[PDB]
């Protein structure tokens, strides 16, 4: 439609996505919790 | 005039007068050979044939003719002498003619055919002279020189070595000592220079200087040449300057001193004023010298250079095509290569890349070590959309130019452009793309270092931009901001007035994610100061940026800017999304106008993930909106497989489906407990996927967290919460810390984090309800019966929570249990003071407790009369009534006026 | 090979090498006054030694030729 | 819990700066400053040193080749003796 918004459409870049600012400010890796889960998970819920 | 003249040195000047003898034997007929030489040599021929003069007089007059510019006259004179002196006396005449025709073949403004004719006549007369006297030094020297003039350098060197061997042998046979022949040494020196043996050449040229410091051709020219090729330009120039100073008429030396002037102006000047002065003097000397040597290819190439830098590209092409091209076969390959190079620069500047390619190629064909031309070819390949070919050219150059700064810059930028292209990221594995990134960084960083090493050269500040952009692509924003700021600090130094608004804005953006919003706003607005000329599309973005920093101090300007932006342009979603949050934070609204306008927003761009995340936040916040059962479908449809493998709405669905399972476990029926055993493992069946997609997502970490405070494995859990505190300042995570904490837990650690929630913020719904429910800390604290001042601290808690919720009567339909909590600790201060000892501090203390007890009775009445009250059985209502009230009415008065007597006793 | 001129050449060469080497070694002390900083920054900011500057500075030169090619 | 959907201030791309592009001739000019006329110091294949046997009196007219052998016992000036040193001796 209106192209005055068009120049802006192609010159601005995304500093941080909505799926990528869900991480705080000094991020810590939580890759230990996958195995922590699938251990405690399976050790708990057996029916 | 044309001879070296130095005080104290020897001289090589010819005699200036000549007498001829006569048979009448009058010993004089003087000829001053500077003046009395007739323009027609036949006039002297008549005298020389008249007196039957000796041959040496013919030769002396001919050499005076030659050493006066009239070489053709001397030639014709000895050619007339050749019709007279028969037989063996011809030898010296042929020697003279050989050298005279060599001289003529050394002349400016010659053609291919004229030069070949002169060299042929030289070779012919040399054949004759060798036929007579094959051992005279003049003939051997002419042999070597003719070999030289025809480009047969190896043959010339071998011939001259054999001649020198022969001479030393003949001298050694008859006892004579062999002195070094200056001309054999000079030829050997020039030949070794041709063979790129610069050390040997230089030694011969220096020793020639010692043997004959007035030798012509000046060995100091060769000295300077070798000094230059051996990377000693200062000594080279010193040599050429000396040659010029001792013979101001030495044109070669004047050209060499001129080149030295250009070089020294370009490399010695410390400021623009000295540069313009010295360069103007060089250009002036160039004009003066050129006015008398207009066929000189070095001077013409200097003119090509000046007219290139003067923007006059048409004259560069004209010099090449009308002057240099016609005399091409008669000029040295390196000079011609530079001339072609400048012609190619001209074509490049005019945008003619086919012709510039052709010209740089022709330049390389006559000097493949022309570094400038090879860079020009690389750049032409860039302009011609031959990027991979240009990279091959530049890396082949890099093999032997590892330390060239411009090459490192160029290779770094080409690799950076590749790394940041999306097409390459779509066609090569991630590891390869990352190695490409680090190769770009290697090139750029070594350029930085090389330029910093020479601590007097200025870094092109774009390198910092590019390094910042490379680190930005791989999500390392600390180093990215560092390099962006380094870029601007170098950029404000050079022309502070015009730094791009982009760098100030983007530094402000990087500061926004850091936390400094006043500095971000500051630089955002120093950038709005300098916005562009036509279609200023940058204002929309700048105003949104300022309006988004202005959200938590002075959001009235958020109001203003967002409103005008959305009124001016409609499609900007990122504007009025945040505007409808400034909405919420201040509630200047009807909820119905909200749902109307957003549930208009929804479908205009259905597949925008962000507004999906806003309507997920629309139905789950502070006031009401309890069901959102369709929100199951909302946030499962946001994914719904069109764009699967994404986290936000996914973890929202997670949170809801785990909230279901607590209500599942509350039931006594085993079927729904086993059913909640599905709403509980759906959690860990999806949270695992979202930690797989992005480990550092903090909120998946609190997912696990809220399980353990709920599934009674808290020990491991408050570890994770202590960590997510490091990576979050949300009040939710830290009040969940004090949640998981409060259970099986002394008091100190609870009230700690609950006054940290207190002071972190000033929010008005979480605060009342949460610290209402968790004065419980001091309450259970007191179920341990610590002391009375902590009982009254729990009183503070209760009291304020009550007055808040009753005055905040907008949503207050949840709290009659709270009311009973406060009534309960009125009851529990007394029940603690019932078992007591008189030796306590008593005046003005527990009076208030009995007052509160009667107040709690009054509070009990209200909940007695209510029917909706399903907290405790109504029988047990009336029964706590009777029990705790038959005890207080017969116990509290007891204690009160029992302690009054101890007040009498103290 | 002990001609006077070879010995003379070699003696002068040794002397001049010694002198030039020593001067190069002492180049740092001779006139690195406070002025090293003045000259380094003056050099840094010469426009002719920065991108586009050579053309700018040469463009400002009045002098030019009566080219008739 | 959950935060509000964040849309931070947007980065802008930079305008084209051809003077610093890799195809910029200004890089060639900056190199020219350092290596300028170097490829011209050799003016012709004679190296600017024409061998002319008519500069030696007695040689071509009287067949006296004495002057080809220089002079004995020349003492060189300061300006000529410094040219006898070895190259790049300023380290």
Author numbering:
A (entry chain A): 163 to 209
B (entry chain C): 2 to 907
C (entry chain R): 502 to 570
D (entry chain P): 16 to 106
The study reports:
The polymerase-associated factor 1 complex (PAF1C) is one of the most important transcription elongation factors that positively regulates genome-wide gene expression.
We found that PAF1C from the yeast Saccharomyces eubayanus, which showed 86% sequence identity from that of budding yeast, could be purified and produce better crystals. We then optimized the crystals of the complex of Ctr9-Paf1-Cdc73-Rtf1 from Saccharomyces eubayanus and solved the structure at the resolution of 2.7 Å. The overall architecture of the Ctr9-Paf1-Cdc73-Rtf1 quaternary complex from Saccharomyces eubayanus was shown to be similar as to those from the thermophilic fungus and from humans. Paf1 residues 9–105 can be traced in the Ctr9-Paf1-Cdc73-Rtf1 quaternary complex. The overall structure of Rtf1 (residues 502 to 570) in the quaternary complex has the shape of a twisted letter “U” that contains three α helices connected by loops. With this additional binding surface, the total contact surfaces between Rtf1 and the PAF1C core subunits from Saccharomyces eubayanus reached to 3025 Å2, which is much larger than the corresponding contact surfaces from Saccharomyces cerevisiae or Komagataella phaffii, which are 1754 Å2 or 1509 Å2, respectively.
